[model samples]
Target: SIKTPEDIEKMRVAGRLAAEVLEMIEPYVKPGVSTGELDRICNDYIVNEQHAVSACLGYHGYPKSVCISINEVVCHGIPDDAKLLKDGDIVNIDVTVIKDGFHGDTSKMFIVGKPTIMGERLCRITQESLYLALRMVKPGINLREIGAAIQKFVEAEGFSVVREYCGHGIGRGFHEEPQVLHYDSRETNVVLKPGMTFTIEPMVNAGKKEIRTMKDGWTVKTKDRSLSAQYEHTIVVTDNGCEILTLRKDDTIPAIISH
Candidate 1:
């Protein structure tokens, strides 16, 4: 459904709360910390502090407030006390908050400690690819253009985009229409409209794009165990271009700015 003005306002509040959770957990993302602890922190803040519901928890029986994907784990890494972060590890924290019946989703890559050069490069490139795709968003443009631009940039950097998990239309429902693909494809012919809202999350890998799910039935990791990183934002298409609803107040990324 195209977002009404009231829906957009509710999404703005939801988006800001989700971004705030990421900021609140930044200090706890270090060596010796368990992903489960981070999940607790996020859940407390979102429920108690912000008065919002975690879209992840109980959604399809996810069983966690946030998704903590470490190292080669691409996405859907369930938070658990058994998984402890160590130095030189890169983790992705994905947060989704529902406020007043609207949902906002976003994720950011965090470095646990001193990261490998390849890991750092992968994070930077993956984030850049997301912004490049955002810049392509505007009224009257084909949605495939966004995927085409991301594919061109990520491939040129010697990395691969995950094809299994593409971004999706987001609003009152967690996952909706207009699936947003990160890699180039001619299949998506939808055109951007002013009231459209969705997410652009590109999961880029340092090696080949092949991935496998762990025995737990949730976590996904790179087939070669190479590093993986992701960045995401919920955006609303505007008359001229788009506005990033999930942009944090402290975000320094130049490509991601307020409307």
Candidate 2:
């Protein structure tokens, strides 16, 4: 759906809260910390401090407020007290929030304590893929260009983009129209226009792109058990180019990138 000016403003509010949750939770992400504990912290902060709703909790029967995928866990990882973070583990924390009936969705990779050189490289390259794609999303561009840019760069780096789960349009509902694939595909080929909001989240595998779903029905992992990494942002197409609603203080890229 094309967002009206008022809807876009509300989205910025929702997006800011989503970004804050990531910033607030960073210090708490450490070795020995359980994923469940991190969820509680985010839940309380989202409800009590931010006064916003956690969009993922109870989402299609999802049990957690946030997705805390660790190591080989690609996405939809359930938070559990039984799973404690270990040193040098790569983690992905996905969060979405609702404010004034609009939503913002984003995620970032975090390294627990220290990171292995290979793990850090994977995370860095995955995020670079997202940023490189972000630089090109504009009013006249084809949506496929976003994925093509990501796929080209990541493969050149010897990493693979996950095919099954792509980014999606996000606003009133957690997800909306236009499945934003991280790899160029025939399923979606919409051209960008002003006032369109959607996510650009790429799940990159350290090995081949093949993935396996766990029996629990939500958590996804790499088939080869190799590490995976991802980064996400919600953006709106603009006359000049685009703007990142979920831009955080720590982001290396500019919030507004012009065509």
Candidate 3:
């Protein structure tokens, strides 16, 4: 559904809140920090500091305020008390916030302590894929262009995009229609229209794209157990381009872009 003006305003607020939370955790995501502790810190901040509801917590029995995926964990990784972060660990912290009856969602990749060159490159290319996709989001363009742009870049880097999980339309509902795939496919025939809103989170792996759901049913990991990285943002379509609702202060990309 196209977003109303009021919905877009509320979504902007929610998106900034989520972006701030991701920015706030920068100092604490280093070595020796347990993923569960990270969750508590974020949950408290989301509730007490920002006065926003965590969309992931208690949603579909998700059991976590934030998704802290490390190394091979692609996405939806439940925080574990024993999962202590260490040097060289590449982690993805994903979160969503609700404000003014609208939702904002985003995630970032963090390299704990020290990271290997391979790990660093994987993170860089994964982010580039997302940026490449964002640059193509303008009115009247085929939606498939987003995925094809990402696939062409990531595959060229010798990395793979996760086919199992894709981005989606998000606003009042956390997950909606118009699944945003990062890899090229036959579907996704819709074209961009002003007021349309969705997320573009590309999950790139160091190995094949095949994925497996863990016993918990929420955690997703690569079958080849390769390092993975992902970056996400919620955006609204505009006349010339799109508005990145979840743009952070540390991001190199602009909050607004054109084709």
Candidate 4:
């Protein structure tokens, strides 16, 4: 069912709470702060303030409240204080909050202090790519168009898109059907409908698209070790177009000033 009005309200509550949680943690993402510490803070915030569950924890044995992927780590990097956040490093904080049987998922990248020119560009372009993809996500639009738009924008900026891990439908289950790929191909041209709810998280790499899995089996890193950045949002199709259900009122994303 295209979530009933009540269902949409429930989604809104969960989504707003998730956004608030992200806002609550933004101030603590400092250079000296440990990723583990950030994980704990998120866990407590979700459990206590939002009275929600971490959608990632125990899902395939993730064992964390948030995924703290550092530079060059495409996605799903485990949280650890040992990997200190240096001044020039960029860190992506992936968060998924589940409350009252609804799910809200989103992520943000942070620049500890002063970032390198490449780091700044990665963040800027990645966020812009996401915004562009969202704009094209209207009813009757091909799902592949989402990825194609993202790929074209990213490649034009001299970057590569990760193909292994794309986006997916997000709802009662953290991940649903309809895998969303970032590269353009004919296979993923499913047309979107009014009820569809999914995520469009694009992982942009400064180098090649090759990726290596860690011994843990969950963490994925760029084989070339080039800097990578990612942005994600859970969206739903609507009568007119689409609604970004997981956007935070206080959220601050790197903008695209030019092309």
- Candidate 2 residue-wise lDDT, 1-259, digit = tens: 8999999999999999999999999999999999999999999999999999999999999999999999899999999999999999999999998988999899999999878999999999999999999999888788888888899999999999999898899889888988898888876678998999999999999998999999998999999999999999999989988999999888999999976
Which lDDT values do the candidates have, in the order given?
Answer: 0.90, 0.93, 0.93, 0.84
For residues 1-259, write the lDDT of model 3, one tens digit per residue.
9999999999999999999999999899999999999999999999999899899999999999999999999999899889999999999999999987788999999999888998999998998889888999999988798899999999998889899889999988999988999988898798999999999999999999898899998999999999989999999999999999999888889999965
Scanning candidate 2 in windows of ten residues, the lowest lDDT window is 181-190
- Judged by TM-score relative to the true structure, which candidate is superior, 1 or 4? 1
TM-score, cand. 1 vs. native? 0.97
Q: Clash pairs of candidate 4?
A: none
RMSD of 1: 1.6
Clashes of each: 0, 0, 0, 0
The regions of model 2 sitting more than 4 angstroms off are none
Q: Residue 66 of model 2: what lDDT?
A: 97
Candidate 4 per-residue lDDT, tens place, 30-123, comes to: 8788888999999999998789989999889897889999999999989886777778889999989999998888887888888899999999
State how far residue 203 of model 3 sits from its true place (Å).
Answer: 0.8
Question: Candidate 2: TM-score?
Answer: 0.98
Candidate 4: worst-modelled 10 consecutive residues by lDDT:
250-259
